[PDB]
Design an enzyme around this catalytic site. Structure first.
Site, PDB file in Angstrom:
ATOM      1  N   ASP A  35       0.833  -1.196   0.000  1.00  0.00           N
ATOM      2  CA  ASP A  35       0.000   0.000   0.000  1.00  0.00           C
ATOM      3  C   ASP A  35       0.871   1.250   0.000  1.00  0.00           C
ATOM      4  O   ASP A  35       1.349   1.680   1.053  1.00  0.00           O
ATOM      5  CB  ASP A  35      -0.891  -0.023   1.235  1.00  0.00           C
ATOM      6  CG  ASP A  35      -1.807   1.164   1.318  1.00  0.00           C
ATOM      7  OD1 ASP A  35      -1.879   1.915   0.330  1.00  0.00           O
ATOM      8  OD2 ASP A  35      -2.453   1.335   2.376  1.00  0.00           O
ATOM      9  N   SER A 199      -0.753  15.442 -12.204  1.00  0.00           N
ATOM     10  CA  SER A 199      -1.005  15.058 -13.582  1.00  0.00           C
ATOM     11  C   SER A 199      -1.270  16.302 -14.423  1.00  0.00           C
ATOM     12  O   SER A 199      -1.808  17.300 -13.941  1.00  0.00           O
ATOM     13  CB  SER A 199      -2.215  14.119 -13.623  1.00  0.00           C
ATOM     14  OG  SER A 199      -2.618  13.814 -14.949  1.00  0.00           O
TER      15      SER A 199
HETATM   16  C1  LIG Z   1     -13.159  -8.165  -0.098  1.00  0.00           C
HETATM   17  C2  LIG Z   1     -12.935  -6.864  -0.796  1.00  0.00           C
HETATM   18  N1  LIG Z   1     -13.341  -6.695  -2.022  1.00  0.00           N
HETATM   19  O1  LIG Z   1     -12.969  -5.377  -2.377  1.00  0.00           O
HETATM   20  C3  LIG Z   1     -12.346  -4.814  -1.326  1.00  0.00           C
HETATM   21  C4  LIG Z   1     -11.854  -3.426  -1.513  1.00  0.00           C
HETATM   22  C5  LIG Z   1     -12.304  -5.696  -0.302  1.00  0.00           C
HETATM   23  C6  LIG Z   1     -11.783  -5.507   1.099  1.00  0.00           C
HETATM   24  N2  LIG Z   1     -10.343  -5.748   1.232  1.00  0.00           N
HETATM   25  C7  LIG Z   1      -9.589  -5.021   0.207  1.00  0.00           C
HETATM   26  C8  LIG Z   1      -9.834  -5.447   2.575  1.00  0.00           C
HETATM   27  C9  LIG Z   1      -9.141  -4.127   2.734  1.00  0.00           C
HETATM   28  C10 LIG Z   1      -9.677  -2.897   3.149  1.00  0.00           C
HETATM   29  C11 LIG Z   1      -8.636  -2.010   3.100  1.00  0.00           C
HETATM   30  N3  LIG Z   1      -7.560  -2.708   2.683  1.00  0.00           N
HETATM   31  N4  LIG Z   1      -7.845  -4.020   2.452  1.00  0.00           N
HETATM   32  C12 LIG Z   1      -6.236  -2.122   2.502  1.00  0.00           C
HETATM   33  C13 LIG Z   1      -6.104  -0.880   3.355  1.00  0.00           C
HETATM   34  N5  LIG Z   1      -7.222   0.028   3.100  1.00  0.00           N
HETATM   35  C14 LIG Z   1      -7.046   1.099   2.256  1.00  0.00           C
HETATM   36  C15 LIG Z   1      -5.766   1.555   1.907  1.00  0.00           C
HETATM   37  C16 LIG Z   1      -5.681   2.613   1.012  1.00  0.00           C
HETATM   38  N6  LIG Z   1      -4.485   3.133   0.627  1.00  0.00           N
HETATM   39  N7  LIG Z   1      -6.786   3.175   0.499  1.00  0.00           N
HETATM   40  C17 LIG Z   1      -7.952   2.672   0.904  1.00  0.00           C
HETATM   41  N8  LIG Z   1      -8.162   1.663   1.760  1.00  0.00           N
HETATM   42  C18 LIG Z   1      -8.544  -0.521   3.402  1.00  0.00           C
END
Ligand SMILES: Cc1noc(C)c1CN(C)Cc1cc2n(n1)CCN(c1cc(N)ncn1)C2
Length: 330
Positions: A35, A199
């Site tokens: 991330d 951008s």
């Molecule tokens: C299951 C599923 N399906 O679509 C998703 C999306 C999920 C959940 N799944 C991805 C779980 C999750 C939730 C988050 N993450 N992982 C990563 C950290 N989060 C961020 C980081 C950042 N830079 N920006 C925003 N959030 C929120």
């Protein structure tokens, strides 16, 4: 030194990407969400409230001969979607794709919110934004990249995310076979802790390029592309039947549509996102309304070049004394 690891979509829509990471001795391999929009390396663990673990692989520090509790250190983070996690901190050996950091802060979750519990494919996060955003208290900790930087052949990492396919994170080198043409580099502001850049404009489909400055962040941990409402309206106006739905939470479009491409500017260069990259599928199973991959950033307070944009490019995160970003077509 260098490292190279494959990153794999968690599902058929590229809702996120997971990369295997070795933690501890003997190694415990967890699949983490790399991330570039955050700065904490945190994991599901043997300390996570049992009812909040549902299928994830856990880190057990007591089984690692190199783990040490970082005495008194705690962490607590909230993400842009409203999800959160918190816990305590160990230091341990962490390796990515053959690149090893000793003494890395590994933030062990005691609590995670429901969206983490409900996603069995993600065992934690590996933050790659600037260490000024790290949440560990009372002693802020460094990211994996900051800890590795001095040892790397070059102080860079690259993101090469796939469309409905695996891709690659490389550390310490630029794979000149992984992109076409040249890499265009652009200035970064670190003042908010992000890989923040400007951008030079956009085009919708085969339309003319609009020269306009769009400040935003290169964020591999955000799935979609979030841009100003004017830009997003101009895009979806080219899709018959597309509309912003308050009940769904953004622009939706008929699943029968073929979407136009979206181009964004990097200096004088242009990155083209094919239309199919903008389709995130039915809003609910069996629906003929599909969720759009370009959404308004109004209310978020920052524009976000998330995976929809980044997966159309080979992206260099240059961590030299003055950081820069590079983009190439591929
Ligand atoms: C299951 C599923 N399906 O679509 C998703 C999306 C999920 C959940 N799944 C991805 C779980 C999750 C939730 C988050 N993450 N992982 C990563 C950290 N989060 C961020 C980081 C950042 N830079 N920006 C925003 N959030 C929120």
């Amino acid at each position: 030194s260098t490292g190279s690891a494959t990153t794999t979509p968690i599902d058929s829509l590229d809702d996120a990407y997971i990369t295997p990471v070795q933690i501890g001795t003997p190694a415990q391999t967890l699949n983490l969400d790399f991330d570039t929009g955050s700065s904490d390396l945190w994991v599901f663990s043997s300390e996570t409230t049992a009812s909040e673990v549902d299928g994830q692989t856990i880190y057990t520090p007591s089984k690692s001969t190199t783990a040490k509790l970082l005495s008194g250190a705690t962490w607590s983070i909230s993400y842009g979607d409203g999800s959160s996690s918190s816990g305590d901190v160990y230091t341990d050996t962490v390796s990515v794709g053959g690149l090893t950091v000793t003494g890395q802060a590994v933030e062990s979750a005691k609590k995670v919110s429901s969206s983490f519990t409900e996603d069995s494919t993600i065992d934690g996060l590996l933050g790659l934004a600037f260490s000024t955003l790290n949440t560990v208290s009372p002693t802020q900790q460094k990211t994996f990249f900051d800890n590795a930087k001095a040892s790397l052949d070059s102080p860079v990492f690259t993101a090469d995310l796939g469309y409905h396919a695996p891709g690659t994170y490389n550390f310490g080198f630029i794979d000149t076979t992984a992109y076409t043409g040249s890499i265009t580099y652009t200035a970064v502001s670190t003042k908010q802790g992000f890989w923040e850049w400007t951008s030079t404009g956009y085009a919708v489909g085969s339309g003319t390029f609009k020269s306009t400055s769009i400040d935003g962040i290169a964020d591999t941990g955000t799935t979609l592309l979030y841009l100003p409402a004017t830009v997003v309206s101009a895009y979806w106006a080219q899709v018959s039947g597309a509309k912003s739905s308050s009940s769904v939470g953004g622009y939706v479009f008929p699943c029968s549509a073929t979407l136009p491409s979206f181009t964004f500017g990097v200096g004088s260069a242009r990155i083209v996102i094919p239309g199919d990259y903008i389709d995130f599928g039915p809003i609910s199973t069996g629906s003929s309304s599909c969720f759009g991959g370009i959404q308004s950033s109004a209310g978020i307070g920052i524009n976000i070049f998330g995976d929809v944009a980044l997966k159309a490019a080979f992206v260099v995160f240059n961590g030299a004394t003055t950081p820069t970003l590079g983009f190439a077509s591929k």
